[PDB]
Design a protein around this ligand. Sequence first.
Ligand SMILES: Nc1ncnc2c1ncn2[C@@H]1O[C@H](COP(=O)(O)CP(=O)(O)OP(=O)(O)O)[C@@H](O)[C@H]1O
Ligand SMILES: O=C(O)C[C@@H]1CC[C@@H](C(=O)O)N1
Ligand SMILES: [Mg+2]
Ligand SMILES: [Mg+2]
Ligand SMILES: [Mg+2]
Ligand SMILES: [Mg+2]
Lengths: 500, 500, 500, 500
Amino acid sequence: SNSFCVVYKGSDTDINNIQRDFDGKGEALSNGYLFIEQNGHYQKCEMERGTAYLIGSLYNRTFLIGLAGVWEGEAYLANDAELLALLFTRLGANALALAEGDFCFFIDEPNGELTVITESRGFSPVHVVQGKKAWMTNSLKLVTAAEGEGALWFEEEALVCQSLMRADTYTPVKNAQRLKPGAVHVLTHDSEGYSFVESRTLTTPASNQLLALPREPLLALIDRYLNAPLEDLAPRFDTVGIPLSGGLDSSLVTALASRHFKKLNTYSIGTELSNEFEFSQQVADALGTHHQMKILSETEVINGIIESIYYNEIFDGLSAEIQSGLFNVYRQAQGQVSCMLTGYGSDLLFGGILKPGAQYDNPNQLLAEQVYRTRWTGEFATHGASCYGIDIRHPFWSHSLISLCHALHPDYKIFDNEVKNILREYADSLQLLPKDIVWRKKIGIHEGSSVNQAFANVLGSTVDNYQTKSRFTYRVYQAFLRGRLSITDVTPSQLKDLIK
Amino acid sequence: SNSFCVVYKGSDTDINNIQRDFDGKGEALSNGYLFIEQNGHYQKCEMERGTAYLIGSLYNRTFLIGLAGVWEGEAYLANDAELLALLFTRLGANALALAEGDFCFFIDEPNGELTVITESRGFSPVHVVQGKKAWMTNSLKLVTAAEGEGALWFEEEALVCQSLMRADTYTPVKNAQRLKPGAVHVLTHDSEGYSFVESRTLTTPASNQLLALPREPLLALIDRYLNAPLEDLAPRFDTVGIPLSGGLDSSLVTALASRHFKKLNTYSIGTELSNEFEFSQQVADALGTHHQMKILSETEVINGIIESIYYNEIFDGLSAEIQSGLFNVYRQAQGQVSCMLTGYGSDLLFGGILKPGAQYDNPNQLLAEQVYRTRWTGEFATHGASCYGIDIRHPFWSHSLISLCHALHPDYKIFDNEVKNILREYADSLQLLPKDIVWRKKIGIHEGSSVNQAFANVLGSTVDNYQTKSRFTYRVYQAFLRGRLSITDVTPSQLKDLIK
Amino acid sequence: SNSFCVVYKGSDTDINNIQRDFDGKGEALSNGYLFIEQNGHYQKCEMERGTAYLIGSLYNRTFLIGLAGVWEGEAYLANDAELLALLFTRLGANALALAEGDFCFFIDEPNGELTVITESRGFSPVHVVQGKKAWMTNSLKLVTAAEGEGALWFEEEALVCQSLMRADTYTPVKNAQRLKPGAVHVLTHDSEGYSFVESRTLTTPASNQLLALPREPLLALIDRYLNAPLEDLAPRFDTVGIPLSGGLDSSLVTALASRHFKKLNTYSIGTELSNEFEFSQQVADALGTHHQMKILSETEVINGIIESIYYNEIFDGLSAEIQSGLFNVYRQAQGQVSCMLTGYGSDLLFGGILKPGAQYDNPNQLLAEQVYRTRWTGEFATHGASCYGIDIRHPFWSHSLISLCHALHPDYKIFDNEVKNILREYADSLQLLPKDIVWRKKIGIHEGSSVNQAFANVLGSTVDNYQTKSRFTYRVYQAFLRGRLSITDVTPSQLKDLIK
Amino acid sequence: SNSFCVVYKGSDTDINNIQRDFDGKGEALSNGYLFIEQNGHYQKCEMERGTAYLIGSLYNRTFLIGLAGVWEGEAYLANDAELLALLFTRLGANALALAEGDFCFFIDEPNGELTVITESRGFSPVHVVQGKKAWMTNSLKLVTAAEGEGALWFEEEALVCQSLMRADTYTPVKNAQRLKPGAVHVLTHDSEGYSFVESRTLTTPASNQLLALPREPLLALIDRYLNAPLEDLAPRFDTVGIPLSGGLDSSLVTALASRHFKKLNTYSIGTELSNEFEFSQQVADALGTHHQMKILSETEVINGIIESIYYNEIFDGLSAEIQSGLFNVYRQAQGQVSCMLTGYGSDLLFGGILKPGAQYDNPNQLLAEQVYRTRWTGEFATHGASCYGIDIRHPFWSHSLISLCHALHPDYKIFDNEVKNILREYADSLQLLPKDIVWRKKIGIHEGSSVNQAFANVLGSTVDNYQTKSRFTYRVYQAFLRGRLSITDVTPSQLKDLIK
Ligand SMILES: Nc1ncnc2c1ncn2[C@@H]1O[C@H](COP(=O)(O)CP(=O)(O)OP(=O)(O)O)[C@@H](O)[C@H]1O
Ligand SMILES: O=C(O)C[C@@H]1CC[C@@H](C(=O)O)N1
Ligand SMILES: [Mg+2]
Ligand SMILES: [Mg+2]
Ligand SMILES: [Mg+2]
Ligand SMILES: [Mg+2]
């Protein structure tokens, strides 16, 4: 309940099929139809070139408004679509890469042509699928629901789940195309009516020359970009949820959140094999939040994996494994909060994944690759949290912080047998978090809870083997997208066949 | 002996593998290498944006020169690349769609990214293959020769040999994309080095509203556009070859050729099952040409098929079958001529594939689909003829004629129990061809020679079943491209395994 | 009698005021009015971005249709406006610089903001005047007729008649702007309603490197480009008028015209003792044409000068002097022919204005300089010949011929004690003109009839002083544009009052 | 800040002639020279298309850096040139309209073509003069100092000292064009070397619909934007000078300035007739600033007028008269402060120029026209204060604040019996100024000090006839621009010697 899709030359027919298995509302376009799920947000506005549609949400309206406001006072009362329409017409499509959010902006032009701009981080992945008709969706399952069990053609698993590094346009669906995040696309049709996408990147590669930014300004920038999101979310939502791990990043977000929201709800998960409760409880107490822990069973851990696969359409094993915890937290917080903040991604920007004390020829490059990889996995899809009535946000994943850190001088990421140095300095400068927390060694979600082990135990493979895990995930991935498995009646106990 | 390829960030190494199975030379680019087959033509030009390359040949230089000459005198002595560069900078990339020929234009810029423009008819089909490295080639086999037998991933034949109509960007190779003919493509790379193709069509769909062009002006245009091709080649050749069938179109081309060249070599093929030799001899006598006839055995018919597959990289059954006769003609003319003209495609423009006296709701739409289908088959590829030292030209296939005929009022294509009415009237005003030829009912190459029946006999199927024929063609296609079969040691007798 | 003007937010009074002195009609536009004289031509076309207007005529429709025909069959029946719209939407504004004619193309966008494109040779000069309201016209007299005598401000004759070489955007009207020929202009208004012309040139300076184009190809191009303008005129007009001087160029046009038209009416003029009749008659008989010479009187010579100034809005001394002869020829045939051809401008392309035997370091530069001068003078305006029911045409002044000669090798224009060497070899090969004509040394219109002497006499100056003669021409130019004088009522009184 | 100029194909003579009257340096360019005064500021950056130059100063670097930082971390250390280059190549030329300052950005293309972008407020006016050579400067007196007294051709005082409504591109100099502020200008040269300015506005008119922005949001916006300019000057400049009149605005600034800087030096002026020292003093106490009043004699006042005309090249009577007070304040602060803040322009944004209690059909339209009027006057010129070693700043004149007030709902600018209502309400909340001050009343510079009276007394005319006052200003203006008068050598006789 959050996704959308559009079909060219489509009618109510093709939509009714979708609506059968998914609830949402249809809407006609000049030459097609637009389907948007129940909990889906959207806005529209008239432009000289046609009607503009903005599907999804914006995370930095404040910044965008401030920008448009330089030349148009009507920027302060503009709805999302009108806001982006102002930037589009004044600064060209490239300006839309400045926007953050799980959005998709497109213009329904009279000539039947669709001009679409995809968000640039992976919050709202969009595919153009060639079925009986051409479909553009941010949820591949919608297409199957409309044209049938065979609509989607999947690639061989031997080819799919083997490598770990892919382009941000990679997709295992042969009869489909993954639109590049942060680019402009025009959906045209040639003389014989065949679909042809014309895409253009909205952002060129940033320099890789070390950024020797002085200490004081750096700290000011970090404080500013981490609080910017929270200040945006401050107005609405009096209460905010936070998956607490007691880790540095998740804890730092809670600290900052304490100064922006009235009430805070912290959640923790772990298995019978291990948990981080001791550290999270320490932060919850220090901040006096409505804390509550939970020890997930094996069945729960697996259910979390397959839920992220279904909802965020993840086919990568590591990603699905990492999401499991988060998905159980959403389930634990359902009905308690409507907004959640995380510390997800910080380790990829400040050097958390680097081994303390180890030597690295080019640590920044190592990190950049990971930042990039999150573009196609589905880790950042928001559909999952949405179906639990949650608007999941990741404060660290902002354009400004990512760009700042992209080539930030390594000495701030790894120095003196430490990691995330500058982030630690900033964290305790807040005088809100306990020293053991601020200086805790990094420990991942799937690691600290031993979810990686629980998963390996059910697949009967070594915790290290992520290719065997991907085989499984890709396997259920196709099963869910082919409609051969309904999220409603599915249990890990009935997936033994997909194991061997 | 005419194809080419480019590899992003490739050394002489990646080329050595190719120059091992094929002949040609490799030149280095800013961030890559360019391989050009032994008998392949190409020119270079220095632009401000970088070094421009023109690989292949131009068919309408005279027209392009006359255009560029409107504002720049140097157009009269510009090489092929410099000529297109003038159009490029003066009228934009769209101006290159005005060019005809088996060419590929591209600019190598310092930034590393190349801007390429593909010819717009299918004379030089270009693919972008994602192997160990990104490859752009107008010959897929070259990539196999470069990285191995597993470089190209082929789709399931059940999915490929089904539908008859395909988009002009269709390709059975999963890890490759067929570049749209008549479009501009910029080959860029993102922050992580991954390849991304930004395409934009150079031409939009023409109008489908009936073109009620008065009789006389129409006849003048037909006289003009059919001769222009011959007036371009006249100064470059004294002798010309012509696959003659005694049909209306190839005979009309011969009549014209006799007025532009010194000697004419007409060739005719057939099987022991049937032939059109009778009609062919009439035209040869009337125009007094150096005529030659040849009966083909089943082995030669099949050999002509698998050759068109290998050289023009054709996987379609009907196309491979049709090319058989032509490929046998090339062998017969080898060493006798260096250029050939045909009447190929005329039936797709003037109503020839229409049934005399039959009623049609939308004849032009029917013809248009056929015209379009030629874009992806490889039937217009030139490599085959080229390897036989022949520059193959199809006079009817010019931009002006195709566009003129696109929506030409149907009463000129089918009327009074006749077809190709306007064309027959035109060929008549020439007073050079016998009436029985000018008004002969149309009969295809694969039909009049019963090649269709012979092909059916070996596959043990029915003449009409081009689905089974495609299975065979796609089958050898895959074998040839994977390098599993060699054109030097392949005979129809050793391919019985692909039939079962 | 074929001019037009456009006024932004004009009222019906503006139009009525104009109609008080000039017959015609006003057509309301989006946010203003468009006026066109009784005998002015104009076509319209509906575009996506608004209504396209094409006022004037096109001289090379055949060539333009051939260009558009490459992709749109409807190009064969498109009106001038539709034809230019096809080129505009397909190849950009730059494509419109490829058309020849005394035209003006503009698009009326609902927002009141029109986009205008001017022809690229000066055949139809266009100004943007800032009176009470903003005007756009190809006739300055219209603004006066509409807003009054004090509408146009003129610069001191001390600054106007001084320098001889000016930019093609030069205008002696301080409150007007001469739109650069061959450029796209966007007429906009800022937030406070002030006019702002955003212009952009559609051409780039051509190369000045010597063109070593061989003799055969060169003669073939001369034949093509010289005969092409006659081919486009053969259809209509059975009888054409030709001002014949007996000069090489005018005679070459008569010979060539004799093989394209049915009836040729040649007209020659001369003053007292100074005439070229002997040579004109030779050609008239050598080609058997309807010839008729007429001796001009003192008053008639001077009147031709004031008429060229009134109609063509010429303020340049030499220009008016030269135009004097042609204006007498138009009157000589004000009802016998509807179309005239001339050899005007030929000397600026082939070196006629060069001194035989003389040595030049850069003759082409000297010539190109003169070619450029004709852009602002008003020599190529069609108004005058129009008001006489004649369609004035100059075969030599085609984009192709001009561009060819631009840097053509000097040995073809001046060599071995001769000039226009290649042009003469061409005429000679026609075996249609007497030797004494093919090699007759260049003699200008104003020189051969001593008009340059007659004009000087009435002013009491020297034949060489054009700075003084320009002061006179500038005097009447101002007078006429202020309506203070009438082309029909030019009494001797006011004449002398203009001498000084 | 300090004047500069560029001369196409300039010679060393030109430069040395300039250094003869004005001290500075000249750096060679691709095809010309670039001069800059001793106190002139400029930075360069190597671009792909050429070398970029940023002459002047940026006032909103932090904001521009916050924009570029979204995609390029290198923006945090880029110089002014590099920073604009970052925005230019990523968001196009339109992006440079988002920057505020007395700057001029231009790119020296290797071919000689110069791409120039002008600031969008009139802070640094730029002209393109056509004298012996072609020039581009922000000081008309530089071209004279290099060409001679006859460089600049001025228009008759009849069409200058009259009209009150001028376009932002208006200039009294006939042979000089005023480059529209907020636009990109490309200085081309056609095939014959003649100059041609191809301009294009970088902004579009903002909507004129009433802005119904609620109270609280509006107040925050006023606060943020009024303080933003001060946060940019906080780091440097420990001390700041503020011309305090005692009015609502200047006082409010002094108030907000006290919460940012360390030491505030307030200055006030007036005449024998009267002054605002009373109110001015109250503010000096409430804030405890370093306030010194100074009465101006008959001279000094008339001197501040001729000073503004020389340095700011102001020719508008009213404009000069207003700047008269500011200049006298600079001299009173020279050596003591390096930066000054003013409440200048506030009345044009919040309605302070409107008559309290009066009814207006469209009060924002009147205000907008005034705002616009300041674009061609020279009021915001910084050259004047610069020479006094002072960086003059006007906090109210920001793109955001201006854009906000443009259509702000009138009830905020004039309700019941008040004006600047919302501004007054804002100042009140600050709790730093006395009631009688916060709710004072509109009182101009030339008014509060009877400066308009003194100026008038020297001309004999009344204090309302600004046509005679402009008559005087326009005369000295021309005198100075010809060097016929010196800034220092201003004989009290030469005043009258002006036929005045
Ligand atoms: N046990 C747990 N309870 C609640 N949320 C958890 C969790 N383990 C992981 N998460 C969620 O997943 C995200 C993942 O984080 P990690 O990369 O391990 C981050 P961490 O919390 O930042 O600590 P670290 O950097 O010290 O390892 C966190 O920001 C957190 O919101
Ligand atoms: O019209 C003008 O010249 C400007 C007005 C006069 C007062 C001045 C100000 O708002 O500080 N602007
Ligand atoms: Mg952790
Ligand atoms: Mg046939
Ligand atoms: Mg002559
Ligand atoms: Mg005041």
